[PDB]
Amino acid sequence: MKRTFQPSVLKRNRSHGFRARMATKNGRQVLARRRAKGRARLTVSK
Amino acid sequence: AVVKCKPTSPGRRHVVKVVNPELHKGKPFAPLLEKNSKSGGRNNNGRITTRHIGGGHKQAYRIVDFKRNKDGIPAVVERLEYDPNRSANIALVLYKDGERRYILAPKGLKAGDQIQSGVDAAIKPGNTLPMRNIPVGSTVHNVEMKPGKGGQLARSAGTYVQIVARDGAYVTLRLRSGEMRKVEADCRATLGEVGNAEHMLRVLGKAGAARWRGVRPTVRGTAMNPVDHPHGGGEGRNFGKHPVTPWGVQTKGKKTRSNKRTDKFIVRRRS
RNA sequence: AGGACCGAACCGACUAAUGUCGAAAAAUUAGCGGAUGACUUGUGGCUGGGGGUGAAAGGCCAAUCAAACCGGGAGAUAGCU
RNA sequence: GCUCGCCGGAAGACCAAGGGUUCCUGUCCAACGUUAAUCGGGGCAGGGUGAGUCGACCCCUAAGGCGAGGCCGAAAGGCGUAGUCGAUGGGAAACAGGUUAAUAUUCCUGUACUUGGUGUUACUGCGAAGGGGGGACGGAGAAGGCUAUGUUGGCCGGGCGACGGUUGUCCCGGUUUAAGCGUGUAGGCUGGUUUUCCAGGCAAAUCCGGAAAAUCAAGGCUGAGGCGUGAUGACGAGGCACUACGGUGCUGAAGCAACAAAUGCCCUGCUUCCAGGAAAAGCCUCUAAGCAUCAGGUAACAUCAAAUCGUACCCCAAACCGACACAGGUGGUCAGGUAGAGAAUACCAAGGCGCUUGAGAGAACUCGGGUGAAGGAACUAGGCAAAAUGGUGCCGUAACUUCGGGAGAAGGCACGCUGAUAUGUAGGUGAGGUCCCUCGCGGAUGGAGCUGAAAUCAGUCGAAGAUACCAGCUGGCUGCAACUGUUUAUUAAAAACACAGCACUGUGCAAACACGAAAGUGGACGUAUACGGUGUGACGCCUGCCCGGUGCCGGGAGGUUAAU
RNA sequence: AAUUCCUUGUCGGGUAAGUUCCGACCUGCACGAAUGGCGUAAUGAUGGCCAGGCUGUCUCCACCCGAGACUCAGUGAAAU
RNA sequence: CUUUAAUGUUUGAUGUUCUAACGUUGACCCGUAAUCCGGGUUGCGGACAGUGUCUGGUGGGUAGUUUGACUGGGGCGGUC
RNA sequence: AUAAUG
RNA sequence: CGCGGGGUGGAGCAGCCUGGUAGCUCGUCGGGCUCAUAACCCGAAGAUCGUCGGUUCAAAUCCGGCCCCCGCAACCA
């Protein structure tokens, strides 16, 4: 079967990445929730 | 000649190609070419607008000379050319100054023919001059809605507008739809009928024929579910509903012409 | 010349068997259909929750779609178990 | 270590995507491996990723994202100009050999090549977000010229062989060599050079474009491969040498010819067809704003610089994606022998493995299959499943039809080996020689050698010669849909959906319509032979009767009618 | 007849025997001319039906070869 | 007061011409190496069109919901 | 202007 | 078996929701017109209302049963 997740670091960085979140206020809300959450992982990264 | 294809294979039996031997077999004049990427019918929002289009063979836009800005300049057509976007053929006119620009091809045109533009020009077809020196009732095309606009009316193949009345600066016209309307006398117009009138004769002849035209197949509304389309439903092609557009606007008899401000230009309604 | 014929790759998923604590949350085996085209696919985008997309099944949109998922109203309500 | 067996268009060898040390060595093993394990993608420790030439980064650009002002929007924000991102594209340049336990076009050896900076010398007018040329393009088909590669012959080296023959028409092995440089071929395109004039190319122009003559008939561009050089070098079978018995040191002959032949190259071609087939920069060329004893531009030489990142391993999988060491899913490249039309398929080479539980028993029953007397669909919801049909050449082939079909209709015949025709033919390829010549990778003549079907005749073997794998069941009536296609991924591949065609209807462009509170786009850079919508669904013969109800359209007298 | 209730209508053909199929009789429960009507060559993993051929589909199964079942050793589930 | 004529004043109901509002996805020039936008001339329309306020009408495109019970089960019928 | 049949 | 409608001169149809006194066309009968028929013209006859019972002063009319006809319903495993 073809699994729904076919990996791709580039497409992941361009959407789920830090800069993709910084591009709009809605992503900054996400990062604010991340820092509020206290999680060590702010965003996916190399 | 409009040769009919032999039914050597299925789906070719109904094909009726319109051969045009006069057309040049070679590459288009390079500088006038420019990119024309497909839109897919999507808008800036990216949501679909014009349904059942897109796809088809790649094509490049031609910079046809609508305005005919040159005045009193002699010219000779170099070679006929086919514009994939257009139904009508285009001619690569060679101006005396050596500048080249494509224009719409009159039905009465051949290679090496001489033409010219300007307020003077000539009654000879293919010339483009403002509607004042034009004799009443002569065939015209590429009419401008406003002076300097370039080209608007009857630019399609096989289409032409004939003068019926000339009310001073106003110039009444018989549009191909039969809807009479006046235009400014200052507006330029090209004499003679538009060429490639045989384009209507083509009947495609195959299921995939829409696909390279950028046309896409249309789904009938009865086939659609009631949630998606106002029609449809039932357990056996049930109907009985009044016909409508998918958004619910009435069809098969629902006029929507009400700009109001432009109505004054209109004289007689289409019939 | 062909949405042409036969037939691999490739694609499509018709019959039966196998298998339904299976090797696999849809397969494999033995036969099929398409296969120069309305073809297939790689890569990167655009279109999204009363909307998208849809050669139209009311399908598809992260194994969930006659209205996705997440979180918040919310300890909703339930003459019911 | 000796044998068997499997894939061998892969079950092999290189990468990308994607994993993140799984790579190599030492050592250990509880836990990890469906078994034991002194084994391991497991534990621990150490080692391993070498670039001016590869890629990325970089210059540039498509879809598209962001977006200085701006427009719009209750706020958030949306749209979008200049710009700048975005390779899945384009853009300068490296090969051969050798070496490590694990890395190399990256190191070493040999041989080069390209883009810039600087200095000297000899000369010269140089110079933009500007112009032009170039970059720069489709499907399909055909044929020619070559190569990768294979076979044979020759040559070289070795063997002459443990059951019969085997110094011969004999057997085994080797016969490998690039980038660069020189020549510039097969072949492809375009008539060139000189001068004048000019509303053309947002300004200018010697460039391009156009109009004129002058004058000769070729010049120039593009272009695989070949031949020399690179290379009296490297590589090289086998001996000769040392063994911690893993390997190292040394030596090293021939290294040609003919034929077959690509999906690879010439070809980003030629021809043909329509569905008319990116953008920009690097590149070439022309000027302006400018600047001339300068700065710059060209040529030669010297010299310097080319940084940064990736480089291990897996990569159709136990390392990716699948909760598994999972019969699944995952793009590209290289690519041989025999048989065959074939990348099918069968058997093999190089190469990789025998799939992480075995040993006996040989029951019912289950699964994967072989064969089976007589009947041959009597089975059953139903010829489901199996059996069978199966290739090439040739004969022959109906009803019906839109005159292409049906059709590969159906139904038969000829298929092996050997010899002769013919001490292997037709054909293909092509040396020696001769001859022409404006001398070259030449044009003719000439035919050795090599390669090599097919057909006829004769003979012969087997029960069976398309002998295996491979490899259509066919015919007739009829329903339906024209047909190709498309659909419920994961129980519905269909009469449904779509379909060309036909009809009606909407629309004069600031188009109807569509998204969006709006701006703006889409339609469309199209516009009435255009497009949207609906219905119908090739084609052939056709398509009536009814406007009462309902929908639409036209008309406006009057009745009525809200805000005001 | 993908519409036909009554019904397995009736007549004719195919089969020894045919609620299906083909042709026809029209009493069309409840076809009808672009939610098209009637034909139609080619085409079909389409529906129904017939023949040849072919066969363990069956009459009636039999035997053999392999993977399990079984025994021994090792590891070691599940629903309930 | 009734009935009526001339002129002025005060406004309403119409039909034409005009420009200054306004519309301009006409052309040219500039910001500007930008077709956006803005500004300046000019052309064609022109107190139309358009938007806002208010209101009539149409309105399943959309939203919130209704669609009772009794019943020898349910529904039909009947009943309250 | 309307008149069928024998 | 349920709901709704209908039954009237020889035939096809009103009146049958507000019960006092059933009409229409055609056919039939008689007399004209034509040499005759059909037609035309004139005149006349013909049904106490499917049948059987109840209220009501009185019923084709309202009510109820029965005998018929017709449309529709006869549903979800």
Tab-separated table of C-alpha atoms (C1' of nucleotides) in Angstrom, chain B residues 8-12 42 45-48 52 205-208 211-212 216-217 219 223-225 227-228, chain C residues 1-4 37-40 45-59 66-67:
chain	number	residue	atom	x	y	z
B	8	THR	CA	-9.969	4.007	-41.549
B	9	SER	CA	-10.125	3.908	-37.750
B	10	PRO	CA	-12.944	4.466	-35.230
B	11	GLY	CA	-13.415	8.061	-34.087
B	12	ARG	CA	-12.075	9.354	-37.395
B	42	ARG	CA	-9.017	29.898	-11.634
B	45	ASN	CA	-8.442	33.770	-5.178
B	46	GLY	CA	-7.611	30.498	-6.905
B	47	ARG	CA	-11.167	29.201	-6.677
B	48	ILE	CA	-12.795	27.966	-9.888
B	52	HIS	CA	-15.034	23.101	-17.726
B	205	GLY	CA	-15.208	14.260	-34.919
B	206	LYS	CA	-13.814	12.693	-31.735
B	207	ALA	CA	-14.369	12.555	-27.968
B	208	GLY	CA	-10.921	13.942	-27.175
B	211	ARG	CA	-9.328	18.369	-24.753
B	212	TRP	CA	-6.701	20.153	-26.894
B	216	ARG	CA	-13.334	20.291	-20.733
B	217	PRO	CA	-16.362	17.957	-20.762
B	219	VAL	CA	-21.530	17.170	-16.604
B	223	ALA	CA	-26.677	13.357	-13.220
B	224	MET	CA	-25.592	15.458	-10.242
B	225	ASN	CA	-26.870	14.924	-6.705
B	227	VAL	CA	-26.930	18.645	-2.740
B	228	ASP	CA	-24.580	19.694	-5.554
C	1	A	C1'	-2.399	8.997	-40.775
C	2	G	C1'	-5.033	6.256	-36.014
C	3	G	C1'	-8.457	8.404	-28.300
C	4	A	C1'	-5.704	1.789	-34.673
C	37	G	C1'	-2.955	8.461	-25.960
C	38	A	C1'	-9.242	11.740	-23.122
C	39	C	C1'	-1.686	8.159	-21.654
C	40	U	C1'	1.425	7.664	-17.395
C	45	G	C1'	3.055	24.981	-6.500
C	46	C	C1'	-2.351	26.848	-6.589
C	47	U	C1'	-7.872	25.584	-4.925
C	48	G	C1'	-10.047	23.815	2.089
C	49	G	C1'	-14.667	22.988	6.354
C	50	G	C1'	-21.324	24.941	4.901
C	51	G	C1'	-15.834	25.080	1.609
C	52	G	C1'	-12.453	22.810	-1.954
C	53	U	C1'	-12.374	19.308	-5.787
C	54	G	C1'	-15.443	16.133	-8.528
C	55	A	C1'	-15.660	12.548	-17.383
C	56	A	C1'	-20.880	12.863	-11.016
C	57	A	C1'	-20.121	7.724	-6.711
C	58	G	C1'	-23.095	12.162	-2.869
C	59	G	C1'	-17.340	10.309	-3.904
C	66	A	C1'	-24.903	13.114	3.644
C	67	A	C1'	-20.257	18.100	5.805
